[PDB]
Design a protein that fits this description.
- Chain B: It is found in: Nucleus; Nucleus, Nucleoplasm; Cytoplasm; Nucleus, PML body.
- The complex is a heterodimer.
- Helix content of chain A is 19%, strand content 36%.
- By secondary structure, chain A is an alpha+beta fold.
- By secondary structure, chain B is mainly beta.
- Chain B is 0% helix and 20% strand.
- The chains are: A alpha+beta, B mainly beta.
- The structure holds zinc ion (3 copies).
């Protein structure tokens, strides 16, 4: 499978793209971003189209596509 | 701000 490219947007409206494959557990994405923002992953909620992204959600389960957006808010 | 692309397993890759 190919990597798809998602855009993760933070509270400050800054921008980080992540590449994942369609069956990758998005907790790996959460961890990396939380680590890059210098905050505990559990202090954050990651939303796809307003819907909460579970640790074991995959882009396939959520119906994600290239250039889809993940929004990060405070928990 | 520069473009940032992180690969969750080279950021140009698609496989
Ligand atoms: Zn693209
Ligand atoms: Zn960009
Ligand atoms: Zn590879």
């Amino acid at each position: 499978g190919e990597y798809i490219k998602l855009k993760v947007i933070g509270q400050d409206s800054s921008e980080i793209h992540f590449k994942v494959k369609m069956t990758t557990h998005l907790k790996k994405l959460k961890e990396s971003y939380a680590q890059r923002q210098g905050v505990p992953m559990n202090s954050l909620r990651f939303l796809f189209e307003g819907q909460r992204i579970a640790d074991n959600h995959t882009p396939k389960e959520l119906g994600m596509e290239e250039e889809d957006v993940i929004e990060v808010y405070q928990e | 701000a520069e473009e940032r692309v992180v690969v969750i397993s080279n950021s140009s890759s698609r496989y």
